[PDB]
UniProtKB/Swiss-Prot annotation, chain B:
GO terms for cellular component: cytosol. The keyword Nucleus does not apply. This is Isopentenyl phosphate kinase. It catalyses: isopentenyl phosphate + ATP = isopentenyl diphosphate + ADP. Retains 38% activity when incubated at 100 degrees Celsius for 10 minutes. Homodimer. Keywords: ATP-binding, Isoprene biosynthesis, Kinase, Nucleotide-binding, Transferase. ATP binds at residues 6-10, 56, 180, 211. Catalyzes the formation of isopentenyl diphosphate (IPP), the building block of all isoprenoids. Has no activity with farnesyl phosphate. Its EC number is 2.7.4.26. Transmembrane segments: none annotated.
Length: 260, 248
């Protein structure tokens, strides 16, 4: 069984204080992932786990310096300094996360997309090594990064790109989205279930004016799950034991289900 | 128009001082490379350039903690801690070297092989990203690293692998190995050259082994020279033979 847990800059990092790290929250999060790895070892169930995390206060601020709008558009400039500057900021934040996971004996290792992913209409993103890590029970930790594209330019690959890509590429069963809110909210209240008998109803409600999330972040997540025909949870990752629960298949936020 | 320079971990590091860095040497070297890229800048000649470095004082001491002799054959143990710990060490070393290159305005970036290279049957090493970086005139810096090995579990890929693989995979023109010796030493003396004639006599003697071979299986052409002699790198980069030629 293959689970992908998306953390995200936010709960790990205050994006208004640059290079900032919410040590306490990060530390509890490693506690919980450890607790859950223990649980699965005790109950003899096979689990493969991949973690993904955003740039947080590390990548966005370094990157903003190298972005400009030209003719109403995003373009990266000065990347002879800027590719390394962003890589280096992300490396540091990957180190902090991985050393903390390691200090609870989670066998975390680093995947750095900047070194090998090419961003086009389809990703080039060879997952051979990852499969071999999972096959050895290592825990791959992949992060938002800067990458080149196949059009003379550059792109930020985010957790939002990374996860669907891997869900699909690796046939994941469970997608966990730890976020800053309690679920997909409909009336300031997480909806328990979303499946093939309400999704469109939910997707329209999300495009509307009574929707508490108008960035369309929820929508994209819901859609990737249906698109990969699996299961996923969107939950508040700031709440004690949600990560542990989620990893056991039972946190309480919004479940999204398109498996089978 | 594509050159590849390996920098012996030995000329960047002191192999007996775990964690040491050779700063003057590291700084002198970044400088000559910049002067070199600059020389070509004027000739209005397009030069693409990849750099490789080993584990030096970083890779090895940390690999050591996780290598057991299981009476023949090195054995990796406790890689649930070891894989990270080795990644981390090589990351430190790469960071220091890329920061130094960047201080001379060399557009360096990190290629970390542990993230995606699988050794074992058929070296799996996707160069898409590297070819694109090269189209931008960035300078990829690849380093010896721990990697997955689908047959044996874990292997340590070295610069000696990476460099010939990539020379043949990108078809590089000029191949340079800067090291702490004046060339390939035969009887304490640097052979001017190495054919498929005298090669027969040379493999015999040699039982840097792995280096001379890995480049033959590839019909490459490389130069082995002394990286400590001020200016060798600058000269070598400009295509002036230095030390030992090895032609396949
Ligand atoms: C500037 C970067 C490299 C951002 C990294 O991507 P992300 O979108 O996953 O970051 P987040 O928004 O903190 S979850
Ligand atoms: C993690 C490692 C020990 C990589 C060692 O790589 P290498 O053998 O190419 O470098 P060198 O030995 O410094 S010339």
């Amino acid at each position: 069984m293959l689970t992908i847990l998306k953390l995200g800059g936010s709960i790990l990092s205050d994006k208004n204080v640059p290079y900032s790290i919410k040590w306490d929250n990060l530390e509890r999060i490693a506690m919980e992932i450890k607790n859950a790895l223990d649980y699965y070892k005790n109950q003899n169930k096979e689990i493969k786990l991949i973690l993904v995390h955003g740039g947080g206060a590390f990548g966005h601020p370094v990157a903003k310096k190298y972005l400009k709008i030209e003719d109403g558009k995003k373009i990266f400039i000065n990347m002879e300094k800027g590719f390394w500057e962003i890589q280096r900021a992300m490396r540091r934040f990957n180190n902090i996360i991985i050393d903390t996971l390691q200090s609870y004996d989670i066998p975390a290792v680093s995947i750095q997309p900047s070194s090998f992913v090419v961003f086009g209409d389809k990703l080039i993103f060879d997952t051979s090594a990852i499969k071999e890590m999972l096959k050895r029970n290592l825990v791959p930790v992949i992060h938002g990064d800067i990458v080149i594209d196949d059009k003379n330019g550059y792109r930020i690959i985010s957790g939002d790109d990374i996860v669907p890509y891997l869900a699909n590429e690796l046939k994941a069963d469970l997608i966990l989205y730890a976020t800053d809110v309690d679920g997909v909210l409909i009336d300031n209240k997480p909806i328990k279930r979303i499946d093939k008998n309400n999704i469109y109803k939910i997707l329209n409600y999300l495009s509307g004016s009574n929707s508490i999330d108008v960035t369309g972040g929820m929508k994209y997540k819901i859609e990737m799950i249906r698109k990969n025909k699996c299961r996923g949870f969107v939950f508040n990752g700031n709440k004690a034991n949600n990560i542990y629960k989620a990893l056991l298949g039972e946190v309480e936020g919004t479940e999204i289900d398109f498996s089978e």
